[PDB]
Design a protein around this ligand. Structure first.
Ligand SMILES: [Zn+2]
Ligand SMILES: [Zn+2]
Length: 65
DNA sequence: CGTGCGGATC
DNA sequence: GATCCGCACG
């Protein structure tokens, strides 16, 4: 494996994370995090980006439609 | 205290 | 497209 597998699938990364190629804290519950008070993962944090899984929640699958 | 990059596999 | 992952510098 490797490495195969080696990657993918652990907690999902924020919009800016995927764009900067970085893993993160903001998990599948990042939204619920903001609900329980989140902030910014390590990425958006260093780059004061925009920790978000919303537009995402709609960009990925959502869909919508 | 930000800054980005190459990779693995579909 | 997505997720992981560090790192070396100023
Ligand atoms: Zn992130
Ligand atoms: Zn973030």
């Amino acid at each position: 494996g490797s490495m195969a597998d080696t990657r993918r699938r652990q907690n999902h990364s924020c919009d800016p994370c995927r764009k900067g190629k970085r893993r993160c804290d903001a998990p599948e519950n990042r939204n619920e995090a903001n609900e329980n008070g989140w902030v910014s993962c390590s990425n958006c944090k260093r780059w004061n980006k925009d920790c978000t899984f919303n537009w995402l929640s709609s960009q990925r699958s959502k869909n919508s439609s």
